[PDB]
């Protein structure tokens, strides 16, 4: 499950760049690794890298 | 002597010069009250301080 934005609010800081919650960064890491893994399935790959 | 009435005070009073210090803690830097002001983003409860 991905919590909504109110659980991990992104705040517009003094610098116009938006600030992301810790949960958001962790979810970004999770999405990155999940996408890379899913890529390594649709096209076969060695069991070592998959593990 | 009592200032309000000018009568002598029955007991005699210890009085003399003593070095006193004024500390940085002043009431006007501490007095605080709130009625529905700003709230925190994550939880919607009143801010701190």
């Amino acid at each position: 499950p991905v919590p909504p934005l109110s659980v991990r609010p992104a705040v517009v800081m003094q610098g116009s760049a938006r600030n992301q919650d810790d949960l958001t960064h962790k979810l970004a890491d999770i999405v990155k690794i999940n996408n890379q893994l899913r890529r390594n399935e649709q096209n076969g790959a060695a069991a070592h890298v998959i593990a | 002597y009592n200032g309000f009435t000018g009568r002598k005070i029955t007991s005699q009073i210890f009085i003399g010069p003593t070095y006193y210090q004024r500390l940085k803690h002043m009431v006007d830097d501490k007095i605080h009250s709130r009625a529905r002001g700003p709230i925190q983003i994550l939880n919607r409860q009143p801010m701190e301080g």
């Binding site: - | 200032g3 009435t5 007095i31």
Partner: protein, 115 residues
């Protein structure tokens, strides 16, 4: 920040009455005089002068709160007298005494200055 102006202790606020008179219902012939913007000076002199009156049964004053500027004077007299009359007569007596004192001080100052 919350400091009152210094003049608040002796200047009457708009609509404020200098003196108010109420009846003390506990006992007969007793009145409470509430005076605004006065302190121990007038209260004490008036109370002592009232105590000098043989027809006054009770005379007292108090400042309800030092941060406020009100004095309450309670006077009880004999049924043949009135607290209002006692108050007026006490003020008149104090004024007479002060006038005599001023005259005699003037005379004494002149005497001392000449020699």
């Amino acid at each position: 920040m919350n400091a009152p102006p210094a003049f608040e202790s002796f200047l009457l606020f708009e609509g404020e009455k200098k003196i108010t008179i109420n009846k003390d219902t506990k006992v007969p012939n007793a009145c409470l005089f509430t005076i605004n913007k006065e302190d121990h000076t007038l209260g004490n002199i008036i109370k002592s002068q009232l105590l000098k009156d043989p027809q006054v049964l009770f005379a007292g004053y108090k400042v309800p709160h030092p941060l406020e500027h009100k004095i309450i004077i309670r006077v009880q007299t004999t049924p043949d007298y009135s607290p209002q009359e006692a108050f007026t007569n006490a003020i008149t007596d104090l004024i007479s005494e002060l006038s005599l004192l001023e005259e005699r001080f003037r005379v004494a100052i002149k005497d001392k200055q000449e020699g």
